[PDB]
Design a protein around this ligand. Structure first.
Ligand code: ZN
Ligand code: ZN
Ligand code: ZN
Length: 87
């Protein structure tokens, strides 16, 4: 169903995020990994985040949020995860 498809797509994106966060290898081939890294870097740099209402940052934060809901591991490399869980 549309919702399921979206949830799966989100989860697959999350797998890429999770991979990328752990993948301390700038030489990684994975376009998805490179993309996630770039998005993460962008977000960290873009202090404006959800204050300015930056779509990139908003998406990363939402992705991280959904990830956090799934991720009971309150010792996760993924940024925001921990903060969201505690919050
Ligand atoms: Zn990688
Ligand atoms: Zn931004
Ligand atoms: Zn996590």
């Amino acid at each position: 169903s549309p919702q399921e498809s979206r949830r799966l797509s989100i989860q697959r994106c999350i797998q890429s995020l999770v991979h990328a966060c752990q993948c301390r290898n700038a030489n990684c081939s994975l376009p998805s990994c490179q993309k996630m890294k770039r998005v993460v870097q962008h977000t960290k740099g873009c202090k404006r985040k959800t204050n300015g209402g930056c779509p990139v940052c908003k998406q990363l934060i939402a992705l991280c949020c959904y990830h956090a809901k799934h991720c009971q591991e309150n010792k996760c490399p993924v940024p925001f995860c921990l903060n969201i869980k505690h919050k």
